[PDB]
RNA sequence: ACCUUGUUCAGAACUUAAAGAGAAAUCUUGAGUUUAUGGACUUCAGGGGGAGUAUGGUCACAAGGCUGAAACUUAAAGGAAU
RNA sequence: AUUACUUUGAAUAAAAUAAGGUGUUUAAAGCAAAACAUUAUGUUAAUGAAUAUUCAAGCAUGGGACAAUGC
RNA sequence: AUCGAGGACUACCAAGAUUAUAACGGAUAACGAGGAAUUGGGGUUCGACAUCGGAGAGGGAGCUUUACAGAUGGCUACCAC
């Protein structure tokens, strides 16, 4: 009712009707599909109880999570269902035997399951199929951090 | 110094001369004392380097004046060191 | 400001021995400073030391006996791989029998000889002839 | 040395090597807390509160008697001021210099020292925000500090 | 009675034991030392390290007497 | 208070050195602790000219300021001391 | 709790570099030839250098001293 | 639409994306790598060319056959021969 804000009807990838109390398929409702991703990642309660619809959410769709897995800090949360993650690493210059600070920005997809995700939070991301021109990752978990009077939520 | 003394067992006189911080184990040069009042018999305990007017607890024969580093007790105020 | 306490300590010790002083005092004490002295004692470069407790990161007094030519700390502690040992000794030590490096490793703070025996590298602290 | 000028003084205090209360001291924590509690209600800085106890009550170190510092005691009673004491006194001086500067526009040394004072404020405000003492919404402003400091 | 907790170390593997700071070996031994001495108060503390059979010996001596650590309580040597 | 002395903290300096350093003059509250080379950070220099010039950018009411070359030319220019 | 550091590995095209053997008459080469079995037989189902690398990333493993983010 | 993800393209919606840790530009007498020359250690310079990967057939562009080509010792058109 609140997720049907587009011109088309929003449905899950795997939508099936539940059985009524009499034991026959009840066409009057659709089961909320939710799967569990792999290497030690728990499904947030919002992906179970929540009523949002997303075809790119790793918990409620057919997008898989493949080998590559990284981590970083949320940089911007202005775009819809997408965030920018910044990774800070050190690059070793052989001649001077000293490291130098570098950074790279990764555009990752943030499902509506993570509602309390704001700028500056620590986020673990996983790699999936290309979901856009640049979005090729997906948020798997996040931890809140200190505030800076700018609570820019997703 | 070209001539050198023991650095673990400094003499009592040598430690007294040194700055309050540059001793082996730094110690304050101040102390706590009590002052018998000229007016009454009560003894008011106060810091050696007090930074305010010191009054008796009974009355107020003011017993000391703060002067930039040590209390200026009145000439008739007798004190002993609280150990 | 005091960035490296170990650098301050080793400069105090080297300065004392060039003047022929019998014992020297180091104001800030640390675990790393104590470990560096213990390595220097095992090679009999300093007679002994005592640590006074001042409740304020107390002081250390080191007794010297005409044997410590120069002990110096090494600025930023490079990550010394086991294959880079003899490259460092060839640069910092006078010969192949005289001096010894000091390294901080997961097995404690050790000189180059026994760190080679324990088969472990780490950051380099300093040296002494 | 000092932060802003080449002066270098070592005028310090010397805590004795005795973390417990001296033998001659007999007042318990109840009298110390309430005496400190009454002083806080009178609008006295924590630095001055301890001095009054030391000079008058002979309690030179409060941590040696109660086991906790003055600010910790005041926070438990809820009497700790919202603006930290050291930051508050710095904004009191910036206001005072600014007021003098309104009438004396040609004073070029007061403008320099006001700049140094305000730089100190931005250093302390940044630190206290990382220590979560001040909420991130806090911000020092000349048009506002005259009222809160007053 | 006091308890010295286990620590995590970095690679760890495992868990925490809730150490606050009053449960550290340093604090517990200092708390025991002060409580044990009670009337007496400690005003000095010196550790002497020397070579004993190619090994270092940290001879702690609680000084000015006015767990598992062998200590030598004594008065001021010359005061 | 003024003045004469002991100690100690901070400040501008001064004298001696068979010692340390440096090309030497000289420096010693460092210009010392440096081929036995590594305490922390920033700025600047690369033979002499051409030249702080031309052009481009920017600031100024203006004079000017900040940034700032190249072509070509030349075995020296320079520092301290006898 | 991670990261960094460090020790072992996994996995990773050759040629080339280093390096093992081999009398191309030596040598640069080649990876073949034989040493002796007087060799068909036998060494023999003969050699292929372990051929090692290797930095910056990535994966696993033992340690947590020195460090960063812890929270 | 494609063998297929994908603003690859279209319609509607929102204002986002990168940058002093050097984006966007400019130069290269620049194809990248294994490697080569010289080196006490550290390094400096080179690598069109054995082998691996990329791109091209005078200049662009558009296509046919087929499992694989935007093929040129295939075709069509324009420019220069």
């Amino acid at each position: 009712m609140a997720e049907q804000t587009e011109r088309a009807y929003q449905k899950q990838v795997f939508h099936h009707h539940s059985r009524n109390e009499k034991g026959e398929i009840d066409f009057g409702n659709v089961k909320r599909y939710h799967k569990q991703i792999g290497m030690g990642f728990v499904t947030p309660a919002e992906a179970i109880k929540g009523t949002y619809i997303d075809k790119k959410c790793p918990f409620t769709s057919d997008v898989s999570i493949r080998g590559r897995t990284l981590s970083g800090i949320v940089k911007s949360c202005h775009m819809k269902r997408t965030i920018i993650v910044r990774r800070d690493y050190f690059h070793y210059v052989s001649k001077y035997q000293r490291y130098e600070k570098r950074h790279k920005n990764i555009a990752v997809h943030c499902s509506p399951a993570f509602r309390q995700l704001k700028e500056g939070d620590h986020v673990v991301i996983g790699q999936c199929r290309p979901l856009s021109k640049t979005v090729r990752f997906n948020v798997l978990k996040f931890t809140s951090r200190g505030t800076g009077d700018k609570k820019q939520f997703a | 110094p070209l001539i050198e003394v023991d650095l673990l067992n400094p003499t009592a006189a040598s430690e007294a001369k040194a700055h309050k911080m540059k001793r082996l184990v730094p110690t304050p040069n101040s102390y706590f004392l009590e002052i018998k009042c000229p007016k009454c018999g009560a003894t008011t305990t106060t810091f050696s380097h007090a930074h305010r007017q010191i009054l008796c607890q009974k009355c107020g024969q003011p017993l000391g004046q703060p002067t930039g580093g040590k209390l200026k007790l009145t000439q008739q105020c007798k004190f002993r060191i609280k150990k | 400001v005091r960035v490296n306490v170990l650098a301050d300590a080793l400069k105090s010790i080297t300065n004392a021995e060039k003047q022929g002083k019998r014992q020297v005092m180091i104001r800030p004490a640390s675990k790393v400073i104590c470990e560096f002295l213990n390595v220097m004692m095992k090679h009999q470069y300093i007679t002994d030391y005592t640590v006074v407790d001042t409740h304020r990161s107390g002081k250390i007094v080191v007794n010297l006996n005409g044997r410590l030519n120069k002990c110096a700390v090494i600025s930023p502690r490079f990550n010394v791989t086991l294959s880079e040992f003899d490259k460092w000794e060839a640069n910092l030590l006078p010969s192949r029998h005289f001096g010894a490096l000091v390294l901080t490793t997961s097995y404690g703070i050790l000189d180059n000889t026994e760190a080679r025996a324990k088969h472990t590298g780490g950051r380099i602290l300093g040296f002494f002839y | 040395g000092r932060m802003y000028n080449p002066g270098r003084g070592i005028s310090r205090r010397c805590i004795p090597y005795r973390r417990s209360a001296p033998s001659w001291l007999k007042t318990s924590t109840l009298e110390v807390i309430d005496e400190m509690c009454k002083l806080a209600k009178k609008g006295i800085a924590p630095s001055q509160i301890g001095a009054i106890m030391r000079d008058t009550h002979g309690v030179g170190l409060v941590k040696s008697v109660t086991g906790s510092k003055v600010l910790r005691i005041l926070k438990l009673a809820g009497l700790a001021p919202k603006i930290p004491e050291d930051l508050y006194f710095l904004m009191k001086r910036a206001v005072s210099v600014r007021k003098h500067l309104e009438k004396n526009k040609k004073d070029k040394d007061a403008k320099y020292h006001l700049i140094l004072i305000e730089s100190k404020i931005h250093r302390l405000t940044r630190y206290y925000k990382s220590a979560k003492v001040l909420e991130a919404s806090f911000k020092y402003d000349a048009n506002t500090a005259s009222a809160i400091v007053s | 009675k006091r308890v010295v907790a286990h620590t995590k170390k970095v690679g760890q593997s495992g868990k925490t034991d809730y150490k606050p700071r009053s449960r550290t070996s340093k604090a517990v031994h200092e708390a025991y030392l002060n409580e044990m001495l009670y009337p007496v108060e400690v005003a000095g503390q010196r550790v002497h390290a020397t070579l004993v059979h190619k090994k270092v010996a940290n001879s702690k001596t609680v000084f000015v007497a006015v767990t598992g650590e062998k200590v030598k309580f004594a008065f001021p040597v010359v005061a």
Side-chain angles (χ1 to χ4, degrees):
Chain A
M1 61 320 286
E3 51 298 7
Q4 296 297 334
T5 37
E6 314 263 356
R7 296 193 109 86
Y9 193 48
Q10 302 284 97
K11 327 187 291 180
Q12 308 227 350
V13 195
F14 312 123
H15 61 331
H16 305 302
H17 322 279
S18 46
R19 331 286 287 259
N20 47 26
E21 283 72 24
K22 94 191 166 67
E24 173 48 338
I25 280 138
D26 175 10
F27 294 87
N29 58 9
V30 194
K31 291 219 283 301
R32 166 107 203 156
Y33 171 76
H34 59 83
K35 82 183 188 183
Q36 55 153 12
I37 56 173
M39 331 158 260
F41 286 106
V42 78
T43 304
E46 186 86 343
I48 317 283
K49 148 160 64 87
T51 87
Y52 74 93
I53 297 278
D54 202 41
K55 305 226 178 183
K56 309 190 192 193
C57 171
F59 307 101
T60 78
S61 157
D62 60 350
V63 280
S64 323
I65 295 313
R66 280 94 64 74
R68 196 73 81 175
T69 287
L70 317 170
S71 159
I73 289 108
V74 159
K75 185 183 171 173
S76 98
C77 273
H78 296 82
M79 35 194 321
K80 185 176 175 182
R81 297 182 147 150
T82 315
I83 75 193
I84 292 277
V85 173
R86 186 175 146 150
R87 302 179 32 231
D88 290 317
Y89 62 92
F90 283 106
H91 181 239
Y92 173 80
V93 192
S94 72
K95 163 162 161 185
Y96 302 113
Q97 298 142 226
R98 289 147 217 274
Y99 307 95
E100 99 197 353
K101 209 174 202 178
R102 286 196 180 191
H103 86 119
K104 288 220 172 178
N105 295 334
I106 301 181
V108 322
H109 181 90
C110 179
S111 44
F114 311 106
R115 282 218 72 155
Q116 289 313 95
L117 183 131
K118 64 194 175 51
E119 297 183 330
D121 278 20
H122 179 258
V123 165
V124 180
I125 78 190
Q127 151 157 333
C128 62
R129 47 192 270 267
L131 308 180
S132 100
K133 179 183 179 188
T134 67
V135 175
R136 320 213 200 286
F137 280 81
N138 224 307
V139 168
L140 309 180
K141 92 166 67 165
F142 85 108
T143 86
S144 180
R145 290 206 179 203
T147 47
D149 87 277
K150 179 54 159 173
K151 274 78 50 189
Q152 168 84 352
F153 292 98
Chain B
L2 262 184
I3 69 106
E4 187 214 0
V5 317
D6 227 336
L7 287 162
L8 264 325
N9 319 50
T11 85
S14 149
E15 283 290 81
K17 281 157 76 274
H19 186 230
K20 82 173 174 172
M21 219 86 224
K22 277 144 172 202
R23 287 166 182 139
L24 196 274
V25 164
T27 74
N29 285 335
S30 37
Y31 46 82
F32 283 92
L33 47 61
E34 45 65 12
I35 309 124
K36 68 66 182 173
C37 180
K39 141 198 69 59
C40 62
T43 83
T44 290
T45 89
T46 200
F47 201 35
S48 93
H49 312 303
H51 305 137
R52 77 203 66 247
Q53 178 97 244
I54 287 309
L55 291 214
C56 167
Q57 92 270 68
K58 262 3 215 222
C59 212
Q61 185 26 247
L63 320 186
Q65 297 293 36
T67 36
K70 202 135 115 184
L71 249 188
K72 180 86 205 91
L73 301 210
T74 40
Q75 84 284 15
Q76 299 264 0
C77 286
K78 220 49 63 183
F79 63 99
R80 89 161 218 290
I81 300 270
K82 274 219 177 177
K83 266 79 65 183
Chain C
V1 286
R2 326 184 81 95
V3 164
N4 208 352
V5 295
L6 185 46
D8 297 347
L10 294 196
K11 215 61 150 179
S12 295
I13 295 173
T14 288
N15 282 346
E17 204 59 356
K18 299 222 209 208
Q19 307 163 222
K21 298 261 151 268
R22 278 318 168 75
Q23 52 181 190
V24 85
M25 199 220 52
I26 289 125
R27 173 153 106 259
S30 318
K31 278 197 308 275
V32 282
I33 302 184
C34 291
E35 306 310 330
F36 206 109
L37 293 180
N38 299 344
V39 177
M40 255 155 49
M41 223 172 333
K42 286 209 244 278
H43 301 281
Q44 290 148 304
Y45 279 103
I46 56 175
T47 288
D48 55 352
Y49 70 85
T50 203
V51 175
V52 314
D53 176 66
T54 75
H55 277 350
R56 270 154 286 208
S57 66
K59 319 187 196 183
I60 292 181
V61 184
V62 187
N63 299 82
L64 313 101
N65 48 348
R67 259 171 218 185
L68 187 48
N69 287 332
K70 171 178 192 167
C71 59
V73 89
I74 287 284
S75 266
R77 307 159 195 222
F78 298 106
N79 323 296
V80 183
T81 313
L82 235 183
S83 53
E84 312 186 18
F85 269 4
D86 38 51
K87 169 190 311 171
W88 275 105
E89 328 172 15
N91 288 4
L92 302 191
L93 280 303
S95 94
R96 324 199 29 215
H97 332 115
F98 185 172
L101 296 161
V102 169
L103 299 100
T104 181
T105 61
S106 275
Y107 307 93
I109 296 192
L110 325 162
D111 38 359
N112 54 338
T113 291
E114 75 183 291
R116 218 179 211 130
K118 289 198 57 24
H119 211 68
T120 313
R123 339 268 280 189
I124 176 167
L125 250 52
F127 54 97
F128 48 90
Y129 317 145
Chain D
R2 321 266 74 80
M3 229 202 310
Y4 287 141
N5 83 325
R8 289 166 186 161
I10 59 162
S11 203
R12 281 185 95 99
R13 90 189 167 178
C14 189
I15 287 316
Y17 194 96
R18 172 172 195 171
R19 296 180 180 176
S20 72
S23 308
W24 53 265
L25 200 42
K26 306 272 167 301
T27 79
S28 82
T29 82
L30 292 325
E31 308 110 301
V32 161
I33 292 306
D34 84 18
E35 274 303 22
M36 174 171 326
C37 205
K38 284 171 3 197
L39 276 182
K41 290 174 191 165
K42 292 196 199 180
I44 298 207
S47 48
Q48 178 78 341
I49 281 172
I52 295 191
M53 310 275 331
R54 168 210 75 199
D55 291 314
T56 65
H57 308 97
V59 202
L61 275 177
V62 54
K63 242 194 72 158
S64 286
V65 168
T66 75
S68 90
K69 317 165 194 161
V70 152
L71 204 88
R72 193 41 191 308
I73 282 154
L74 297 198
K75 294 195 314 213
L76 293 195
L79 295 158
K82 164 220 157 176
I83 297 193
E85 174 225 348
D86 28 11
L87 178 68
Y88 170 84
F89 275 108
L90 229 47
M91 313 172 8
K92 212 226 303 178
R93 285 197 311 190
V95 160
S96 147
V97 176
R98 187 98 67 171
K99 151 103 170 302
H100 160 237
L101 216 55
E102 306 293 353
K103 39 198 76 147
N104 279 316
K105 279 182 187 161
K106 254 172 75 181
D107 204 349
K108 312 231 189 183
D109 229 19
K111 288 180 185 168
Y112 176 69
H113 289 125
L114 163 69
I115 275 174
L116 299 194
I117 286 167
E118 287 188 353
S119 323
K120 268 173 185 184
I121 289 172
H122 299 325
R123 290 181 109 154
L124 264 162
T125 316
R126 178 178 55 201
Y127 156 63
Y128 278 140
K129 279 182 184 170
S130 306
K132 283 305 221 179
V133 161
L134 290 160
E135 45 289 55
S137 48
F138 178 87
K139 167 193 140 199
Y140 165 71
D141 179 35
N143 303 46
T144 292
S146 315
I148 59 166
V149 149
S150 54
Chain E
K1 182 69 150 57
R2 289 193 183 74
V3 164
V4 185
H6 267 234
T7 75
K8 16 162 7 88
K9 255 204 18 242
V10 170
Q12 241 284 293
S13 52
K15 181 117 22 148
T16 16
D17 317 5
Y18 175 51
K19 264 340 122 218
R21 210 102 168 149
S22 46
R23 271 167 233 262
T24 43
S25 157
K26 266 200 63 194
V28 164
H29 299 183
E30 289 276 339
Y32 278 171
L33 175 55
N34 241 24
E35 260 156 14
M36 177 210 136
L37 283 178
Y38 206 83
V40 202
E41 216 165 350
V42 47
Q45 219 163 109
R46 308 213 188 148
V47 199
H48 196 285
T50 326
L51 258 190
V52 314
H53 288 17
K54 278 59 91 204
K55 286 345 196 154
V56 63
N58 282 290
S59 147
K60 187 183 207 2
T61 92
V62 164
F63 184 80
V64 177
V66 326
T67 47
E69 329 187 350
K70 31 207 161 304
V71 202
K72 281 146 38 69
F73 295 70
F75 272 104
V77 75
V78 82

